A paper describes a structure:
In the catalytically inactive [name] mutant structure, a phospholipid-like molecule could not be built due to lack of interpretable electron density data. In PV 3Cpro, the protease activity and RNA/lipid-binding are mutually regulated and the two sites are dynamically coupled. Similarly, we presumed that mutation of Cys160 may affect phospholipid-binding and partial phospholipids may be dynamically separated from the binding region; Therefore, the mutant could be used for phospholipid detection. As expected, the [name] mutant showed strong binding to cardiolipin (CL) as well as to phosphoinositol-4-phosphate (PI4P) and sulfatide, but displaying weak bindings to other categories of phospholipids, such as phosphatidic acid (PA), phosphatidylserine (PS) and phosphatidylethanolamine (PE). By quantitatively analyzing the intensities of the three positive spots, we demonstrated that the binding intensity to CL is 2-3-fold that of PI4P and sulfatide. Thus, CL is likely the dominant category of phospholipid that binds to SVA 3Cpro. In addition, the CL content in the [name] mutant was only ~40% of the wild-type, confirming that mutation of Cys160 affected lipid-binding and that the lipid could therefore not be modelled in [name] structure. The preferred binding of SVA 3Cpro to the CL may therefore explain the observation that a portion of [name] mutant can traffic to the mitochondria.
Seneca virus A (SVA) is an emerging novel picornavirus that has recently been identified as the causative agent of many cases of porcine vesicular diseases in multiple countries. The full-length SVA genome is approximately 7.3 kb in length and contains a single open reading frame (ORF) encoding a single polyprotein that undergoes proteolytic processing and cleavage by the viral 3C protease (3Cpro) into four structural proteins (VP4-VP2-VP3-VP1) and eight non-structural proteins (L-2A-2B-2C-3A-3B-3C-3D). SVA 3Cpro is composed of two topologically equivalent antiparallel six-stranded β-barrel domains (A1-F1 and A2-F2). Three closely positioned residues (His48, Asp84 and Cys160) within the proteolytic active site of SVA 3Cpro comprise the canonical catalytic triad.
Residue numbers in the entry: 4 to 211
Write the structure that this text describes.
Amino acid sequence: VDMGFEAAVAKKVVVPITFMVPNRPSGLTQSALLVTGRTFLINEHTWSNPSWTSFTIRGEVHTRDEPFQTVHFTHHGIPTDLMMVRLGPGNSFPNNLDKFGLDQMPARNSRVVGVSSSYGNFFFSGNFLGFVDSITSEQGTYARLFRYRVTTYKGWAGSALVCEAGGVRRIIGLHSAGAAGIGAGTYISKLGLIKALKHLGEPLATMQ
């Protein structure tokens, strides 16, 4: 199996993130996706949880009261589990926009590869089960996901989901949830990322 693209995702995109809390003996660790500059992707259910007082990413500590610029993605007025967060000034992330987005839909039963830094680095995989308008979760309804047949675990949220369409493999999701042997990831589109990055002021050149 060619895994060159997934290896590049592990090398440049997926990183661990740990949220520190005052009501548990240990931090909550999962994965995050570096997009470009000072902007990354993270699950909304993790970001919005009220307990954490700081988090660490890329060797940096950030407190909850910092003036983060954020976008919470919605679909037809229903919340998704996807947040984009732009940090204050600091050392830049790689520009990983070449690794996100597919213009065609993945075929039924094609291979999904998850790329995680949640428990050290690892891959997981399962068959693509299709897009769903929403999932019903212990925290409410979330919109615009796709599913895959593989048992997933607490902490695996934020892992990059690499799918295949039109002879190319790209990241089109971030892991969100699990239910009885089936995982669900929140969909990522290139157009949505670009629109949100512009809203947050992450400076980029436009190819003309």
